[PDB]
């Protein structure tokens, strides 16, 4: 079992924190917020680095490029912005979605960006030119998450419409629709680090590990509270193999991936833990919470 304990609490955002992500090189933590700002922090010591500003309304997601040099954010101003970490410059503003942008990610090569929106579409953008390459009529309700697979050949999307869908990056064809015997909103999805599974959250207090190629649910993770918000979930692979997620009872939940048992609950936040992230090489978890809390917390474990 892990032994995560609190090391740092990071105050700075003036509204709910919407996402936290460690840079692939392990150096930084990026946070986004309803306060319209992205903030960069030292991953190991929590030391504030810089604020990145530009969006006109709150931000729902931020993501790193594979080389840790760029970030992309999605906002209620209906744009995405591509940022250069070193300079803080907005290199491109991606305009095309007709409603709020909810989620975003680079592909492994960091030459494409995928985005999901309240306009019910998934869009694929060229990073270099900042132009919209494809618009997929993906869902019948807002798109809650989008993620590229290990080689970038596939995109997985999730939606409040209750569906998880797999898309061919090149053609834009819908290759698969995944759903279980109940039809609750799907609030989050991502491929596993090894690329052969997807982890999906639904708003019935349940996380599920799918073999997406076979279309079978392999594992379910329960114990947490999730009926309202699109809470991030993660694979922890640096020490023991865990599943990590936020919860609406104000705690971070950690499960054993294989046994599906709850192995730890991290207490400290004063509001719903909306976002969590796992560091790429060290046993470090970042967590952040909604309007009544406004803080980010860094937890560390020897296992």
């Amino acid at each position: 079992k892990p032994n995560y304990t609190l090391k740092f609490t990071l105050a700075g955002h003036t509204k709910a924190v919407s996402a936290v992500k460690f840079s692939p090189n392990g150096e930084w933590l990026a946070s986004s917020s309803a306060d319209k700002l992205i903030k960069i922090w030292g991953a190991y010591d929590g030391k504030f680095e810089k604020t990145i500003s530009g969006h006109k309304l709150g931000i729902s997601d931020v993501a790193w490029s594979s080389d840790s040099r760029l970030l992309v954010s999605g906002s209620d101003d209906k744009t995405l912005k591509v940022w250069e970490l070193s300079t803080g410059k907005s290199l491109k503003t991606l305009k095309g979605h007709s409603n709020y942008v909810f989620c975003c990610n680079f592909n492994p090569q960091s030459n494409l960006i995928v985005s999901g929106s309240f306009d019910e579409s998934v869009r694929i953008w060229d990073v270099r030119t900042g132009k919209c390459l494809k618009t997929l009529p993906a869902h019948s309700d807002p798109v809650s998450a989008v993620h590229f697979n290990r080689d970038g050949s596939l995109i997985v999307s999730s939606s409040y419409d209750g569906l998880c869908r797999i898309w061919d990056t090149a053609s834009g064809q819908c290759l698969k629709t995944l759903i279980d015997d109940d039809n609750p909103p799907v609030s989050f999805v991502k491929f596993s680090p090894n690329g052969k599974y997807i982890l999906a959250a639904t708003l019935d207090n349940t996380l599920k590990l799918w073999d997406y190629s076979k279309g079978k649910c392999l594992k379910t993770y329960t114990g947490h509270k999730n009926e309202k918000y699109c809470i991030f979930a993660n694979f922890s692979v640096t020490g023991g193999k865990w599943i990590v997620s936020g919860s609406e009872d104000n705690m971070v939940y950690i499960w054993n991936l294989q046994s599906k048992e709850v192995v730890q609950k991290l207490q400290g936040h004063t509001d719903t833990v909306l976002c969590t992230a796992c560091h790429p090489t060290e046993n470090i978890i970042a967590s952040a919470a909604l309007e009544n809390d406004k803080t980010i917390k860094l937890w560390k474990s020897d296992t």
């Binding site: 917020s33 309803a34 709150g58 729902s60 997601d61 209620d76 909810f102 309240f118 918000y229 309007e291």
Partner: peptide, 9 residues
């Protein structure tokens, strides 16, 4: 609040 910080309608 931004979209992710708004609860299920």
């Amino acid at each position: 609040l931004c979209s992710r910080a708004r609860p299920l309608v």
